[PDB]
Design a protein around this ligand. Structure first.
Ligand SMILES: *[C@H](O)[C@H](Cc1cocn1)NC(=O)[C@H](CC(C)C)NC(=O)c1cc2c(OC)cccc2[nH]1
Ligand SMILES: *[C@H](O)[C@H](Cc1cocn1)NC(=O)[C@H](CC(C)C)NC(=O)c1cc2c(OC)cccc2[nH]1
Ligand SMILES: COc1cccc2[nH]c(C(=O)N[C@@H](CC(C)C)C(N)=O)cc12
Ligand code: NA
Lengths: 305, 305
């Protein structure tokens, strides 16, 4: 029993973190096989920042201009290239701690763990979600760039996020490991803003199922709803639409608990229209949306890696 | 910016987790040098789980009865002894991944990371506070016994908790690594009750300082209170009395933000008496008490390990 915002064990990713320095800029890199991946803005000076021409700046750099340090060991850089907003530094040594890995681009609503790092060393690990507005609500200070987000599937680390920037509202933006930003953001010191965010409905439903699994079920009512009628209410409360695919993804949780998805939707509708009236669910006074259906099954089943 | 419940990187502890089986019972052990530490109830059967004579049971066990598995390798058990509620299995191989470590007994109100494990493998990592009533609010299923809690300081892992039990209320109980329970619990198959809990006032204040550091300032007011007047209010709300030692511990955060502790106390008094009027603090609609002052400083200053 209990239900917590749980991160993945971080050891497999800890063994891949290095420091990358170019000029006066130091940030984190990810060392997998004989390649180190990091944000390309490591090559910028403070002036370059406002309007960098990354292609021109990169032409001016040589392999020796990149100082890559894995703990106390300097790695020798033997090639470099840029892929979208990421630099790839080929080094002459493959990382002996490379886990089985993949690069994936995740969809809004999917969760992952972040290993926040500074100067190539880890500070801590936490779980977060890709928001509908393509930002993440992280904990990152200047210097954290190149920290990564990931999921673990058995023994395979799926890297999905690399950190690049903080937006004015204090939320975070970055890329996949091919260097393509999530959202419309760019890696320059310019005016940018997150769009209005919304609540991840399928995840709220998953967390309500977690509550029922844990015996916290005061909010279950005696009604049902249609997907249409539910979505009309969701729109009014800044919730994402629920699709039939979401309904089917929630099937096993609905069967485990005996509460059909559309019946849970009727209970959620009442929670939105009437509020929680000072009550909590799983210790929370708000409806939580950063657990996916699989996060619930994983945690309530004791899945290991 | 951003403030998250952040666990320590778990790799150093992952390298110490093993599976321990005796009879039909499998749980987790902690392998440090040539000793595996685990809950002693692994030796019991259902016939004696109600009140075991552990001294007699241990005499009747053979080293051969303990199956210890570190990943894909069986470790030969060459001796067994008991210290309070912890069994110590001497093995013929010293763990090459043993970190620098200490065993510590933590105080109520302090925090630690839990690496939840099943069958010697990790499921996830999350932060817990030791409650004033000597329970923790974790996420643990049958099979999680022997999972540990810890802090890291530089390169040194301080182990402080080993999991043994879930109470009827769904909170969790265990021992230090010398096998002494936190609180008035015993390692028997019985329903046990904790004493009444309280809110950790110094931690709530620390988290309000964290909110200010992260720009969430709406709850600040221009008023100050005396320590005595603050305690009269907070005790009605089942908050621990704030002592001058607590005020002193908050000194660094008070100096960083320029807000005296007794000024912040007047903001907390108003939050207690009036609520939040629909607003949130660091994304929460409740006052959070599971961050220590040190936890705030660590996260906001980017301490690494
Ligand atoms: C990289 O270590 C750092 C990550 C960070 C900073 O705070 C939290 N995380 N990223 C930057 O510092 C980043 C570098 C750019 C993309 C070249 N810049 C910003 O995040 C940034 C710039 C900026 C501006 O400039 C006009 C205005 C408001 C916010 C803001 N954030
Ligand atoms: C060990 O893996 C397991 C940990 C656990 C279980 O649920 C969450 N975590 N610990 C136990 O199962 C523990 C074994 C004892 C120490 C021998 N028993 C309990 O936690 C327990 C027993 C019990 C009873 O027994 C009648 C009634 C109500 C609650 C309850 N909890
Ligand atoms: C009638 O129950 C079902 C029907 C169809 C598919 C189902 N899947 C699960 C399923 O995964 N439960 C989890 C356990 C759960 C607490 C998270 C597990 N067994 O690990 C149940 C189920
Ligand atoms: Na005040």
């Amino acid at each position: 029993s209990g239900f917590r915002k749980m991160a993945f064990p971080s050891g497999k990713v800890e063994g891949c973190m290095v420091q990358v320095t170019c000029g006066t800029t130091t940030l984190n890199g990810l060392w997998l096989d004989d390649v180190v991946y990091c944000p390309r803005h490591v090559i910028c000076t403070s002036e370059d920042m406002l309007n960098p021409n990354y292609e021109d700046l990169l032409i001016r750099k040589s392999n020796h201009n990149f100082l890559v340090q894995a703990g106390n060991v300097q790695l020798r850089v033997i090639g470099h290239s840029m892929q979208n907003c990421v630099l790839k530094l080929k080094v002459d040594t493959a990382n002996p701690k490379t886990p089985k890995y993949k690069f994936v681009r995740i969809q809004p609503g999917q969760t992952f763990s972040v290993l926040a790092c500074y100067n190539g060393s880890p500070s801590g690990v936490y779980q977060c979600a890709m928001r509908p507005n393509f930002t993440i609500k992280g904990s990152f200070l200047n210097g954290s760039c190149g920290s990564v987000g990931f999921n673990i599937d058995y023994d395979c680390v799926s890297f999905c996020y690399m950190h690049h920037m903080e937006l004015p509202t204090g939320v975070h933006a970055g890329t996949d490991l091919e260097g393509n930003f999530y959202g419309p953001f760019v890696d320059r010191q310019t005016a940018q803003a997150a769009g209005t965010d919304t609540t991840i409905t399928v995840n709220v439903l998953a967390w309500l199922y977690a509550a029922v699994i844990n015996g916290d079920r005061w909010f279950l009512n005696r009604f049902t709803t249609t997907l249409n009628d539910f979505n009309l209410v969701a729109m009014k409360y800044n919730y994402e639409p629920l699709t039939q695919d979401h309904v089917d993804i929630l099937g096993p949780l609905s069967a485990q608990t005996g509460i059909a998805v559309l019946d849970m939707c009727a209970s959620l509708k009442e929670l939105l229209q009437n509020g929680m009236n000072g009550r909590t669910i799983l210790g929370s006074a708000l409806l939580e949306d950063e657990f996916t259906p699989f996060d619930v099954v994983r945690q309530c089943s004791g899945v290991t890696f």
